[PDB]
Design a protein around this nucleic acid. Structure first.
Ligand SMILES: [Zn+2]
Ligand SMILES: [Zn+2]
Lengths: 258, 38, 434, 66, 604
DNA sequence: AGGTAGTCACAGCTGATTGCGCTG
DNA sequence: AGCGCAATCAGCTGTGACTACCT
């Protein structure tokens, strides 16, 4: 009766993968997608009751991605490949927006988990976790929405795991620490599949038995309301708790309340 | 007496519904009363 | 008995041959414990053995018992084998055949499990999923009725012989139908997937009498387990023995097939569930069943008193007399509780205890009433003149294993009637040598 | 030596059987030897009447809801 | 009809299936209603079935109701008509209404308003709209004794005739046999003959919605009719009576069972009715608060039906009280109405509306059916499970824990049979240890404990051994009052022992733990009353019985009322930490010495 | 061989007796 | 040592089940 749900969020930012292809490195977006598909196939292999969802995080929007091989796995992989092809080929850069919409993808993942939980029969409990692989740099403009998503995930007891590839993200560290998930930075990109199978494949009950890397140094720098940048020391209002980098005689947020 | 206590406890604690329930346990919270949860 | 117990009792050659098919590897992997699956997945892409200590260091100290159990089960199933690492160390590496076939099943490679389905085009007489489910239910009900002995259900003679070999029904006199035993009642009280699994295990055990390959039958069964519901598959590409086994499965209701010469066969929900809610129970000892078939009504009436029979509902009361009668028939209280819980209505699943504790406790207590008096035939010895003489005879009886009860305070002992002659001979010889 | 069936039960049922021995509810003194506080020795030829009597005692103070 | 498996099968009788599982209801040919609680329309179906049928069991999943003639009489008493009830029964059937229920409903509900009984000028007249029914019942010999002085005919307007006041019970018993049930409807809105009083309940006594349903069903179409309302002791029962008395706005009479219930009713009236003490009087031969010339009179049973010589003051009070009409004679503890001397109490006074209030309507000797014509039909029956779900009734965790009989006691239990075995299983040392352990455990957590124990001989040695207060029962009036008063507002003492005294409706304070030992034989009423003293898992009540004794069968047969109410009795075989601490009768010496004193009664 | 009125236990009430207290 | 309130006994009755005798 143990139903495990694994929603995998893939950072599909075209600019970062294009730069990676320009670097002519051994790791590309195709290999990352293959590793994600193999991890999902393994998750479905572990038990009948396991459910899988793959969400691709893109600049324009968030896309729900999902011969000797398993029949259900074959259809799932074909659907994932078709969806990722449709997303990438029709992805036209129209605007100066470059930061990935990670917060929206996590919100959609939470909504999908909420939908799945109701459809789960009352005799079974659907344990849900969200795995995020990070490719591009962190986005500071989405601080409030990301924190709201973290709090929503914590309220429903949903694990959030981050698998950072190149550049660390403070928001992902905070999400992993608050929701109880694991934060891991991959040293060798081609070993992404092995890292996922070794670390993020087991469930939280299985994570208790297995010895896993200790949590990384999570930062808690706040975002200034008028600058939206990381700060160490800032002015915080006493009424609305809004954070400001510099002293002001009249709080901007308190202006709303007359 | 020392032996009387043991004999009385053995008789009382395991008379009818223990010579078989304990055998099953050897071979194998909401609805529990407060004294059964301590 | 589950699949792992039967797999562990097979010879290493049979296990090695089983792993040659990708479908078998997936079933074995899913039958593994939670901790074993992670170890298999981690070592899936390894070409070198790992130190035993390194593997043992993956789990925490407190959960070492589960680690030992998983390692022992993996060794018994021969998924991995011990390798003599240079330097006196011992390395563990997955079986190359099993690992290759598991990767093929997961990643891909080789040819498809079934030959093809588009060669013959669309099926002219294809059915629907509800129709297949109804056919499976009808077949299983016919089988269970033939177990009872009603003349309405007529099956093959070999199917009856299979039940005879299983011990459920015994044919004391030829010509007359066999009579069902207590094990038949217990089997009927079991749930349908468990009944199917027990029947298939008996078929596997007795297949050697028919001269059929165990490995091929197991591989085909596992392939049927992973088959997609409502999708046909190619009969072609199977040996003649496999054809007979498929015909037997069609007789059992697992597989739908219009004709014996037909090249298509449709797996049913029973076949998919082979590898692996209408009863409402009330605190007033009443059962409400949302069923219409005579099979469920009879099964519920085996351990309960029927009160009303509505067109779509059955109102029954679980009383002491009915439970006592069912237990006298051979059905234990645990089986009754399991049957009630498995068939429990979806509404009852909301409560953390699916079955109310009072009803289960009352049924268990009613079971204990029958065995209140324990009977052991024997011979009593009470003519011991000395304690020392009693001790030697008691030790001899314990050595012979014929002792029933001992009383050192009153120098009283009880021995089995079979060992009475041996004890008498031993006692007489001691006096003669004195 | 004595031949029969050893009966193991709760002390209450042992006292009930001892009472049945002296009360002559079965017609004879077949409850011959008492060995333990929870064990007695009974002749095997009429173990059925003891079962009937125990069942009558059990369902007498039961009030079956049927 | 067929017994293939011993069950009455009616599959062919009701084969109608238009919607698979839309309707959460089942009907039976003879009569029965099965309801599905796990339905979106559960509340509407409950409201429909309560008004037309009385329940027989209300478990957590499938409620079961029964159709009776009096239930249909009550249903048609309300504005519900034959067409409405039939169409809404067929509306929720899921199987089709058998053609044995429609005819029964038609026959029952057609002959409801044909015959009426009215009270006017201290005279009883039976009035029928249809003149033919009078001649139809004219041939009955038993009715002819009621009519005095040849009954010339009472030609008025509508045909009516006088009936004998002292023989009104006989004609009520005969009318239901004649398929012409009598109705007691009091249209208090327009009387102009009765001196309606100025009673008015305060606008601060709020009542729960379930009481609203019972009160609304009492006054269906602007008139008050006799009926019975069943509400738990912890629930609001006296409040319903006070509100009904205020709404009737006439001279009210309240009858109780004990001489302490009159003070309870007086306190309730003073709390929720705003009535001056001059109008309120108590008639129980203790203070004589001038009952002559009163608005609301409170008295008790066993005093209005004396068969012996009466006191001069009491005789004058009775003479005054038997000479005027009463509006809404409230009867408390209505379950003990069908008695030899309590039935005549209804016929010895004249009242328009007779309201019966109780918590445990069950009774032996099957005399509850007589209460259908003695007073009226069962109006309201509270659903205890949904009442405790709302949180206004304590969720009591019922326990049935048995204790094995010691070998030294079981020999004497099986040796003797002439009523001397009651003290043997009552004074079981194992049950004594269990009771002591429960008392100590619930005292360690500061829980108020009431220990009911009949067979006061056992209670004597049961209470002095623990050195705790007990109520022998004929002790005094003051000692019992002070013990019950210091039981609640005192932390030093929080456990008391009661011997059949708390088997009625008293003013016992809120309690959480009830431990009953050696109750009556099969009194479902007594067990229900004892349970009612706890509800007001907030609480839990235990019943201690001795195995392999008649107390087992008694406990089994005395819980069938509570399981019908929805309670489940968990069986407790072992008490955790029994050997952890020291308990009485630890060794066999005092246990076998107890046999000497328990056999020392010898009441021969 | 089967069933109903006495009968016992335990409680209630009301109707009298009858026995102790009744001033700085 | 006269009144008066209060404790106390008699008679009847309700509740529940047990038990002796005979058509
Ligand atoms: Zn700022
Ligand atoms: Zn501010």
């Amino acid at each position: 009766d143990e139903l495990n749900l694994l929603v995998i969020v893939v950072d599909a930012n075209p600019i970062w993968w294009g730069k990676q292809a320009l670097k002519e490195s051994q790791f590309t977006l195709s290999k990352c997608i293959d590793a994600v598909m193999v991890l999902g196939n393994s998750h479905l292999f572990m038990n009948r009751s396991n459910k899988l969802a793959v969400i691709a995080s893109h600049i324009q929007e968030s896309r729900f991605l999902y011969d000797g091989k398993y029949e259900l796995l074959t259809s799932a992989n074909e659907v994932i490949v078709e969806e990722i092809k449709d997303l990438m080929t029709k992805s036209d850069i129209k605007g100066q927006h470059t930061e990935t919409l990670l917060a929206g993808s996590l919100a959609k993942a939470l909504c999908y988990i909420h939908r799945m939980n109701k459809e789960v029969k009352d005799n079974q409990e659907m344990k849900s976790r969200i795995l995020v692989i990070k490719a591009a740099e962190d986005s500071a403009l989405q601080y409030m929405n990301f924190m709201n998503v973290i709090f929503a995930a914590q309220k429903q007891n949903i694990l959030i795991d981050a698998c950072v590839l190149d550049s660390d993200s403070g928001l992902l560290q905070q999400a992993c620490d608050i929701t109880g998930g694991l934060y891991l930075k991959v040293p060798q990109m081609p070993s992404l599949l092995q890292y996922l199978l070794w670390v993020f494949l087991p469930d939280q009950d299985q994570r208790s038995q297995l010895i896993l890397p200790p949590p990384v140094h999570v930062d808690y720098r706040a975002a200034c309301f008028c600058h939206r940048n990381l700060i160490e020391i800032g002015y915080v209002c006493s009424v609305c708790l809004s954070i400001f980098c510099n002293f002001s005689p009249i709080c901007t947020t308190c202006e709303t309340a007359f | 007496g020392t032996s009387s206590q043991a004999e009385a406890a053995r008789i009382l604690a395991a008379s009818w519904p223990q010579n078989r329930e304990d055998e099953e346990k050897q071979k194998l919270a909401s609805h529990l009363f407060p004294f059964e949860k301590l | 008995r589950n699949l792992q117990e039967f797999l562990g009792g097979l010879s290493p050659g049979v296990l090695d041959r089983l792993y040659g098919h990708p479908a078998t590897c997936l079933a074995v992997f899913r039958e593994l414990p939670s901790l074993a699956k992670n170890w298999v997945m981690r070592m899936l892409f390894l070409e070198q053995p790992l130190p035993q200590a390194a593997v043992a260091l993956w789990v925490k100290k407190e959960f070492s018992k589960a680690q030992e159990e998983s390692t022992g089960l993996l060794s018994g199933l021969r998924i991995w084998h011990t390798q003599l690492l240079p330097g006196g160390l011992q390395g563990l590496i997955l079986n190359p055949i099993f690992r290759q076939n598991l990767r093929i099943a997961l990643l891909g490679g080789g040819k498809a499990w079934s030959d093809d389905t588009s060669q013959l085009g669309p099926d002219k007489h294809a059915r629907d999923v509800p129709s297949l489910d109804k056919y499976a239910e009808e077949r299983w009900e016919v089988v269970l009725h033939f177990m009872v002995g009603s003349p309405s259900a007529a099956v093959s003679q070999d199917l009856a012989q299979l039940l005879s070999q299983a011990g459920l029904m015994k044919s004391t006199e030829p010509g007359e139908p066999p009579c069902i035993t207590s094990a038949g009642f217990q089997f009927l009280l079991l749930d349908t997937p468990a009944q199917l699994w027990y029947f298939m295990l008996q078929y596997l055990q007795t297949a050697q009498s028919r001269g059929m390959d165990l490995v091929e039958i197991l591989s085909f069964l596992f392939q049927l387990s992973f088959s997609t519901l409502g999708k046909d598959y190619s009969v072609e590409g199977m040996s003649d023995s496999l054809l007979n086994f498929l015909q037997h499965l069609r007789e059992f209701g697992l597989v739908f097939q219009r004709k014996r010469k037909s090249r298509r066969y449709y797996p049913t929900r029973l076949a998919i569930n082979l590898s692996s809610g209408f009863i409402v129970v009330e605190t007033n000892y009443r059962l409400y069943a949302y069923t219409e078939s005579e099979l469920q009504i009879a099964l519920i009436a085996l351990f309960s008193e029927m009160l009303y029979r509505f067109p779509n509902m059955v109102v029954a009361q679980v009383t002491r007399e009915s439970v006592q009668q069912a237990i006298a028939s051979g059905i234990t209280a645990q089986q009754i509780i399991h049957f009630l819980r498995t068939r429990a209505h979806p509404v009852m699943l909301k409560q953390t205890p699916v079955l109310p504790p009072t009803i289960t406790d009352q049924i268990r207590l009613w079971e204990l009433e029958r065995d209140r008096l324990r009977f052991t035939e024997g011979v009593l010895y009470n003519q011991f003149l000395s304690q020392v003489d009693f001790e030697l005879l008691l030790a001899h009886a314990r050595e012979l294993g014929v002792l029933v009860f001992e009383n050192s305070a009153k120098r009283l002992m009880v021995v089995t009637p079979a060992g009475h002659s041996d004890v008498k001979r031993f006692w007489k010889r001691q006096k003669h040598s004195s | 030596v004595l031949k029969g069936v050893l009966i193991e039960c709760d002390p209450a049922m042992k006292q009930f059987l001892l009472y049945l021995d002296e009360s002559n509810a079965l017609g004879k003194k077949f409850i011959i030897q008492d060995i333990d506080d929870t064990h007695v020795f009974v002749i095997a030829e009429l173990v059925n009447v003891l079962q009937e009597r125990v069942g009558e005692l059990m369902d007498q103070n039961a009030f079956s809801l049927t | 009809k067929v017994d293939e498996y011993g069950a009455k099968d009616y599959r062919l009788q009701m084969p109608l299936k238009d919607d698979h599982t839309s309707r959460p209801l089942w009907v039976a040919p003879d009569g029965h209603i099965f309801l599905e609680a796990f339905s979106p329309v559960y509340k509407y179906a409950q409201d429909f079935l309560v008004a037309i049928a009385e329940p027989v069991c209300r478990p957590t999943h499938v409620h079961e109701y029964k159709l009776t003639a009096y239930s249909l009489y009550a249903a048609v008493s309300v504005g519900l008509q034959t067409s409405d009830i039939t169409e809404y029964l067929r509306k929720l059937s899921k199987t089709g209404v058998p053609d044995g229920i429609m005819q029964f409903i038609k026959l029952c509900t057609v002959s409801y308003g044909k015959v009426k009984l009215v009270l006017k000028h201290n005279r009883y007249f039976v009035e029928s709209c249809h003149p033919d029914v009078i001649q139809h019942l004219l041939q009955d010999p038993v009715i002819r004794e009621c009519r005095l002085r040849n009954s010339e005919g009472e030609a008025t307007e509508t045909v009516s005739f006088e009936v004998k006041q002292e023989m009104i019970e006989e004609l009520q018993k005969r009318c239901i046999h004649l398929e012409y049930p009598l109705l007691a409807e009091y249209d208090f809105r327009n009387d102009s003959v009765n001196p309606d009083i100025n009673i008015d309940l305060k606008p601060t006594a709020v009542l729960r919605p379930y009481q609203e349903k019972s009160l609304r069903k009492m006054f269906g179409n602007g008139r008050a009719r006799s009926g019975v309302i069943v509400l738990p002791c912890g629930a609001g029962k006296s409040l319903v009576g006070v509100t009904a008395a205020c709404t009737v706005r006439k001279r009210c009479l309240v009858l109780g069972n004990s001489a302490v219930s009159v003070e309870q009713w007086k306190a309730q009236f003073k709390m929720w009715s705003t009535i001056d003490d001059s109008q309120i009087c108590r008639f129980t031969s203790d203070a004589k608060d001038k009952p002559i010339g009163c608005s609301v009179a409170i008295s008790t049973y066993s005093m209005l039906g004396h068969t012996t010589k009466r006191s001069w003051e009491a005789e004058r009070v009775m003479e005054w009280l038997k000479t005027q009409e009463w509006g809404l004679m409230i009867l408390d503890e209505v379950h003990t109405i069908p008695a030899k001397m309590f039935r005549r109490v209804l016929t010895i006074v004249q009242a328009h509306c007779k309201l019966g209030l109780t918590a445990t309507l069950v009774r032996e000797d099957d005399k509850i059916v007589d209460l259908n014509f003695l007073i009226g039909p069962k109006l309201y029956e509270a659903n205890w499970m949904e009442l405790q779900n709302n949180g206004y009734i304590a969720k009591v965790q019922c326990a049935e824990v048995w204790c094995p009989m010691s070998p030294e006691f079981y020999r004497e239990y099986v040796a003797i049979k002439t009523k001397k075995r009651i003290l043997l299983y009552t004074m079981n040392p194992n049950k004594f240890r269990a009771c002591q352990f429960l008392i100590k455990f619930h005292e360690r957590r500061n829980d108020k404990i009431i220990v009911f124990a009949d067979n006061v001989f056992a209670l004597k040695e049961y209470a002095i051994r623990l050195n705790k207060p007990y109520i022998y029962g004929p002790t005094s009036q003051g000692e019992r009052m002070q013990i019950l008063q210091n039981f609640k507002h005192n932390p030093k003492i929080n456990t008391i022992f009661i011997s059949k005294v708390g088997d009625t409706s008293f003013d016992l304070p809120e309690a959480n733990v009830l431990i009953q030992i050696s109750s009556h034989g099969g009194s479902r009423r007594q067990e229900a009353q004892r349970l009612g003293r706890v509800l007001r898992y907030n609480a839990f009540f235990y019943s201690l019985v001795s195995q392999d004794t008649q107390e087992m069968a008694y406990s089994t047969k005395r819980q069938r009322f509570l399981v019908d109410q929805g309670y489940s009795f968990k069986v407790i075989t072992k008490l955790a930490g029994m050997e952890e601490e020291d308990l009485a009768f630890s060794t066999k010496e005092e246990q076998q010495q107890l046999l000497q004193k328990v056999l020392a009664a010898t009441d021969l």
